Amino acid sequence: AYFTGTANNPADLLAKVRVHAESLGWVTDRASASEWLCHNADGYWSFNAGANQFQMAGNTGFDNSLAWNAQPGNSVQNNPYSSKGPTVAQLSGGPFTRYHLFATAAYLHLHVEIAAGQFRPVMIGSLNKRGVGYTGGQYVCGSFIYTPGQALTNNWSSHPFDGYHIQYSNSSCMLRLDGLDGGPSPEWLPFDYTTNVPRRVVGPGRGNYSSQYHPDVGLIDASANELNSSTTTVPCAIYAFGAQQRSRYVGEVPDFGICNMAFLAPGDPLVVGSDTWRVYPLLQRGTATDFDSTSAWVGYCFRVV
Amino acid sequence: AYFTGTANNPADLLAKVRVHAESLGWVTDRASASEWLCHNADGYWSFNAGANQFQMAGNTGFDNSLAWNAQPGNSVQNNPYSSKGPTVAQLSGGPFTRYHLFATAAYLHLHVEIAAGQFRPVMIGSLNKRGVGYTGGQYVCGSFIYTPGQALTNNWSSHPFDGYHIQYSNSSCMLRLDGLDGGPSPEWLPFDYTTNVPRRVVGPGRGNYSSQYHPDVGLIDASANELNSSTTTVPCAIYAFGAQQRSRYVGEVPDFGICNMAFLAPGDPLVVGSDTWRVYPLLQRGTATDFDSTSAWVGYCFRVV
Amino acid sequence: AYFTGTANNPADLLAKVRVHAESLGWVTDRASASEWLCHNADGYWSFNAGANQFQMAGNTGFDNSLAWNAQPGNSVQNNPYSSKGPTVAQLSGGPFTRYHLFATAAYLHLHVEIAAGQFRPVMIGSLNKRGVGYTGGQYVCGSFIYTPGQALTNNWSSHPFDGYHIQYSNSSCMLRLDGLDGGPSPEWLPFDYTTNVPRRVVGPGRGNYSSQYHPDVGLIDASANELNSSTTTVPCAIYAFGAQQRSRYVGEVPDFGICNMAFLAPGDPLVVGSDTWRVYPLLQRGTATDFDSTSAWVGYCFRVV
Amino acid sequence: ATEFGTAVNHADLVERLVQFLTASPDLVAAGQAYEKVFDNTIPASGTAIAVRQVTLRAPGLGGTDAIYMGIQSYGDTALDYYNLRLMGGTAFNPGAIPPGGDYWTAFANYSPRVQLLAWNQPMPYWFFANGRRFWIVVKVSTIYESAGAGFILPPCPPSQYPYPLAVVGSYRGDVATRWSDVSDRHRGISSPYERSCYLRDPAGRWLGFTVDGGAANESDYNNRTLLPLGCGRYAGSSDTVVKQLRDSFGKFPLKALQFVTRETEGRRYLGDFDGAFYVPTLNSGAEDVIVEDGVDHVVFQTAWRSGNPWLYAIRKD
Amino acid sequence: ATEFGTAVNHADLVERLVQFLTASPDLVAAGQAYEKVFDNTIPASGTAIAVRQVTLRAPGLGGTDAIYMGIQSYGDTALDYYNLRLMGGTAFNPGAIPPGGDYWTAFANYSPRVQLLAWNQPMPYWFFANGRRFWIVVKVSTIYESAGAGFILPPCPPSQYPYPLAVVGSYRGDVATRWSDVSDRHRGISSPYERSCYLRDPAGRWLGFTVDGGAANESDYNNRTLLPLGCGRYAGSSDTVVKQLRDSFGKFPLKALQFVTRETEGRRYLGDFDGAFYVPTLNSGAEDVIVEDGVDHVVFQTAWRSGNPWLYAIRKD
Amino acid sequence: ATEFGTAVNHADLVERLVQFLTASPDLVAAGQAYEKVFDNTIPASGTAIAVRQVTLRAPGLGGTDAIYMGIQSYGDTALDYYNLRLMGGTAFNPGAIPPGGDYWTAFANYSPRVQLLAWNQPMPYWFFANGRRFWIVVKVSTIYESAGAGFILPPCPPSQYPYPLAVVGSYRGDVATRWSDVSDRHRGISSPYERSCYLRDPAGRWLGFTVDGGAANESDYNNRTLLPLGCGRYAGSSDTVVKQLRDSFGKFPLKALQFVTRETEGRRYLGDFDGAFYVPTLNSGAEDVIVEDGVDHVVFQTAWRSGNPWLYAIRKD
């Protein structure tokens, strides 16, 4: 359910998380020291460990003779971008301070403190359908850093579930939505807003950035109560834009929330009801208005069980 | 029906019009060389001939022992003005060039050319109910001139059916409307607009003056057609304002219309259909924009039978 | 007078029109399956049928030993252009939908619907002198298309009687005017406006283009009457520019007019007087402002007898 | 001549309109039915509903007139509208249509288009028609869309002005709009604004009428208006008798709607709306029926607001 | 707890409201009925309709709360309105009323009034009520007036904030307005504007919420709003996802309405509307009923416009 | 139908004009003479010359038309002008004249006035007249004043447009001007500018034509013009063929002058000037006579300049 560990290199994190998944019944179609093709009852995913980063992609079928980025219905070729790039999570060379892993039969969440105050999330799973009838729903998110030393959360940066970024090559997260607007079932919609593509998706990923496009943003800003110092969980609703520019609410992120960390220290819990919450910062602790050099006070909350 | 004559003095006009009325069955309750109290099936009227003007008043009952302006339900005391004055038609000393008289069982219309180009109307009757259920409807109108030599149609002037005038002493026309807003039946509403009195009435009297208050004004301006030189009759609708400032359309002037005399000479007829029309200027012939020294080109049209 | 037919190839059109001309007394100095040297009492013409286009030239004398483009006084060498090219009418490979031919002793007019909505004119004759004493007057006009798929009536295109075109190699029509400004009698003036040559000619050919140089252009735009839906014929006056830049009106196109086809369908007749008119579009039916992809609503009118 | 009903959708609504125009017992018995001279579906619908185009001919009451009208259905699913466009003309020729484009340019002295706003759903509807003019009203929840066209009644003999054609719609047909539009431009017949009512001049030139001025509109139409609701030209106050009009002892006064033009060249009265009048709001509203001299009149209000100056009655006969 | 009907007039409508509040089988059986602590008619009606004043007490679901509400009927025949005013409070004392004046000043920590606009005529009506909050909706032709008041659901224990009273109405109650008002200020619960929704702070000071700014409104409320429809604060474009929201494969998503305040002193989340949500317009409209998890929801739209951002659903239970 | 002479003064010139119109052998023999319906001298001349007012009726060639024209003489000695004003109309009524003022307002659908500029002295003069139109030219030293009025020749049957009346003068008649005026506005028939040529529309509204634009002029007339000299609309250069036109081997080409209107509502061709054409300047000038097909044409030039685009020929028959 909740595991903690350490890793000097990304390969160690990779080995440990596969060990955990296998111990929990996760089905790995093909495994190696650096490359994974795995699946569950919900979807198929493929991962590869680089020297200092992780490459992730979704999948719809399996072929052992195809490369890690060439599986049937892979997101590389079936996406609106002209660049045709897969999901990237840019890590460091290590050693990593620690890693915190949430494992379930339907989703896998990871938060790695690579260095003092430096954190990277890696998210995989399927959105809670909540009774809505749609095929797909599998989401894969990584973390990207623009340039060290300069504004780290600059406009060109992309983040999990992000609603605003400028980049023509790579995406930080992606969501499956099948048969949208009469197209072929395999459709891997990225989180983009400026490409003006007919079909796309959007989320609260950046939190409370000045130009974040989501109507629940104010809730995150207001997630903290000054009168009683109480904090609440805000569902992470995702939105989809179709051909006629007519949006459709698609769902919420399972067991996940976003909040303001103004009055909380990293890891400080606040039990709301019978369920317990673990809160950690996205990238690093800074001030309220430091949207350039850090991730301000946005905090990711996971339900610990 | 249509009579023409001459008179050196107002008394002669008075004698002739009583002779005509009596010949037509009009009932004169009391007659003299200068004072009249008469009535018909519709209402009661009282007239008095001064040296150079006519004094008119409405009535609801008769008393031979009361003065000309003291009959039961007389308009002098039963009107919203503080001044309490009766209807006045300011004429000249004569000799009068001519007079044109329209006589019927329900109304009496007079147009007197006192001098070359100088005309005075005098109107009495009852509005055509047109099926509307209301008590009263008797209207009496005279003509007032502000000052000779200066702007004759100045703002302070008042005219038959006028919709805009400034004066605290006398009125140029008046209309009966009984039981308005729960008041006593005897109510003699004047044509005033600036007194802000709770109950009042308004008409197209001034024609197409800059500050005339009536929505049909544009019709009079447009009463002439340039393409075919055709002229039409515009009903003279009257409006009433009550306590809650909520207006009520009350009716139209029988056998009467207003038009533009731009392309017509005085007395020039234009037969529209089987009925024949006689058109005459209100006060005098001038130009289009002479609203100060004359009555511009407003023309009164009567159906001749 | 008025003939209609079909042709799968230009050679068929050629054979049929020679048959018609011979049946009408036209004198053909030399005939072949593809090349013609013919003449009448007015002038001499030479035609050649290519694979997908017609080559036309004027002539002043005959020599059977000279090529089609080498006759005495041919326009190729006796024109102000440095390129020295003959008249060209660019057709298609067929099959041609239909062809409509007007034949007379003095002129020959042809309008070929090569495909649905695609029309090509070919005009030969002599201008009506109208009593003006000048030698020559023979005009030969063809049709040129710039490039299929792009703006078909682009600026570089040239049309019969055109007043504005950009091209250094070929011309779409040409007019004889002998002895202009003391030069040798053989002079074949082209319809050009931008070459700044001392001697040239201009016509209403393009109709109502934005940069058409002719003072009667507005008539074509106004050729239609909205009030009564009436259409009139506008004479096609031609203008000549001499050495001192002093223009001279030269004449009008016989039995020919230009009009606006906004409220008419192709072939719709409107009999103005005892003479009957046949109207057809120049190139294709489009909208009012489509001067790039089609010939807008310019319609050529011929007097049918 | 009158039909009250509920159409399952816009296509069925147009079908019912044409069936009414051709098979109403009054129309057929008196021989006043219209002729469909054209009916087509040219475009290849993509993310849009099928487009119907119809052109009909009316002969008038006397059988000696020539009236040409055109109707269109145009819709888009992504923006979710199923607009109905209307236009009028004097002549028609399918051969005059240029390649591609549209057919409404083939009309001689073509007029710009007006429209009514609907969608694909059951909608209550009210049709009125006579050999010279047709009126359409649709109840969209609490809103009422209304349009129509036909001949006005000039005060002059028909011999010299045989063709007094007027067209009126709730909004201009040169742009696509969604019927949930709340802007002040979405309004009714009794008060055109921004190209919502056109009338053909005897000279053959179409003139637009607007009850209120507008910078976006061309300057020429500022001088010509519908006087009844345009009393503001001569009055020196915002509040006038017309906005405070109210019934009289239960009697609702019907006031005729009037065309007028006041140009520098000269003046001219053009005529009245046949079967349309102004009526007040207080104590009343739409769907009301009032009987005058044995003739009934229905009430309707404009989409923007239902205030006093935006409420008109239509004769039902 | 729910009643759908048609009241012959405003007085009968108020009578039916009180009869519902005191004799609904659910209310009486569960012992949740309200108590009328005051009922009077103080003024001497002139050219106006009789004025009813009522003050009722609600105990809440648990029977340990104290809720005080006041209702009024105020009408004028000349201007032809029969407005219904509403207010909330914590305490009441008839002896505190000064000579003359009015009784609504006697309320301790009195709040300004809101209202709903009606007139004397048959009107279809929809009442919802629960021991903590009441909602009123009225269908005036194609317009829908709506108002209500009760406790919101804060995320904190009631022990320290026992009194989260909110009041909402279509327009401010400090002025008399005629229901034919077409101004943009006449709007609904989901989008208050110009003093159309008040909420009591735990400090005991009433704060007003508005989804859009206004110069005439006081500066303090510009900072506190209803975020769902107030997405414009953070977005850098007029068109956003919220105005383009639409159903998903026939499933209509219900979005909760949220109070939020963003002051310089500090931030605080206050709670949600109990039984009110936002919903889209396309392919739908008012009077529609949608079933989610066996619980039904009715649809309604605001008087000004029925566009996407002005359309809210109310839980009917 | 034609007279060339020298009038001793303006009054004698007008006398000779009327004597020509009533006693020309062609006019009387063919029964085409005009009728003087009015002749008067209303004003009391102060430091001014006597004012003559005349109104005449023309029946047309066929004897079934009704043409009404008015002429006036107006002069001032101090400023030293003896202007002659002209106007046209359809009806006349001496009783319609208001007290004082003037009689030209009595005309039904009255048109504004034009004029010609002269003085009291021997002046050479050229009159042309036909049952439908009259033309006046006067040689003032090296300047040529010219004016006239009558029916144009539309391309449509007279049955529907019986009244194509046009009036043209050298300068606008709304102001008093001295014939020594050198401004560019003082010009001729072939090129009206600033209200120098009016034409009556079939709708009954007078429209002004100008060959060049002007800010002081109203916007509406900018769209309607005389195309022949108005080639600048479509050409993209100042110098065009029309200004460089010249004779052809001694043959002078006569080009008809054309009315055209290009409005947003629609287009319409109106007709041609009957007996007026454009001609070049080089090697020629005024007083020249050119014979075409046995019909003679006289030449004239405008007061401002005698350049190529300001030189017109009139048919003398």
Numbering used by the authors:
A (entry chain E), B (entry chain B), C (entry chain F): 2 to 306
D (entry chain A), E (entry chain C), F (entry chain D): 2 to 318
What is written in the article reporting this PDB entry?
Three tail fibres resembling bent arms protrude laterally from the baseplate. Each of the arms is composed of three heterodimers of gp47 and gp48, which are rotated 180° relative to each other. Gp47 was classified as a hydrolyse belonging to a nitrilase superfamily of proteins. In contrast, gp48 could not be classified into any enzyme family. A loop and three-stranded β-sheets of gp47 form a positively charged surface depression, which binds the negatively charged α-helix of gp48. The gp48 fold is stabilized by a disulfide bond between Cys142 and Cys174. Bacteriophage JBD30 uses its baseplate tail fibre to bind the pilus. The arrangement of the three heterodimers of proteins gp47 and gp48 is such that they form a unique interface, which can embrace the pilus.
The virion of bacteriophage JBD30 is composed of an icosahedral capsid, long flexible non-contractile tail, and a baseplate. Using its baseplate, JBD30 attaches to Pseudomonas aeruginosa via the bacterial type IV pilus, whose subsequent retraction brings the phage to the bacterial cell surface.
